[PDB]
Design a protein around this ligand. Sequence first.
Ligand SMILES: COc1cccc2c1C(=O)N1CCc3c([nH]c4cccc(OC)c34)[C@@H]1N2C
Length: 304
Amino acid sequence: EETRELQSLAAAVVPSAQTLKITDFSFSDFELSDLETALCTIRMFTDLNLVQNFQMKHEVLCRWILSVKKNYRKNVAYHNWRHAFNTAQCMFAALKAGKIQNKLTDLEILALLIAALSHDLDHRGVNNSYIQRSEHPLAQLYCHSIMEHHHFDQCLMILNSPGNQILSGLSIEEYKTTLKIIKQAILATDLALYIKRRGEFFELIRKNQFNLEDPHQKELFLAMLMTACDLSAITKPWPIQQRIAELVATEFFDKNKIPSMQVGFIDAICLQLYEALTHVSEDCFPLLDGCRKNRQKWQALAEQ
Ligand SMILES: COc1cccc2c1C(=O)N1CCc3c([nH]c4cccc(OC)c34)[C@@H]1N2C
């Protein structure tokens, strides 16, 4: 049934990060089976030293990963398991290739990876729009009166389910700190909260006053990082981004104006974010470079 899946997952060899290409910003998931994305996820926890430092039992981490995946099964494509898996992959690539890993504590890295994986688990719970089909990120802003939201209840419920407690090896003080960061990183994937707080982040960077060691600026930086990862399909190699963008038209759920939608999207949201991210961490330039190349391809298409 799904004992089968867990048994098969826990027994399998976990290939290296290099084999799985999860350290690349150009990572493509389409050829992977769901079960291979779970192996990729295990590898992310492993290479961030989270399995070791917090003594996560292998079977427990496998079951938690499958619990998370299972609870995405009714979500639309922009908020599904593949979305959260890729949000996590971008986080991993930005932590590793982008080197952000070195700037953060282990509890921050742990909360970030769990948040990336879990941030859309409540999409059907806290939204009455947006759940029939994948809606453009900016449909929030211009189309519906009420915006598109995220929550952490499902996240914490799965984390505390018997057999799924990847955090049992934390002390009480570590657990409390981690849950707090998880809650904020999940709420930060609300585009409303990004728009509300980004100008300050940009000013600090413009004025070269950005100080990651300030508790308000660390919260704000972790939030921008969550948004960078959540929106990262806008950075992908052109064929990936085209087919994801077109899901607003192609998703079967039980293309004429898309070029101008995506250019507007890049000009109003995406370009500044990856520009700002690259000033904090120069090795995240591939996200910005990808976002630039896609604007150029979408602009050429808009010129028909
Ligand atoms: C931060 O989110 C992303 C970043 C980079 C690539 C992304 C996404 C994302 O949201 N997604 C979500 C949609 C979908 C993806 N991969 C899939 C594989 C099979 C089916 C799918 O949708 C039905 C996808 C898929 N990709 C490629």
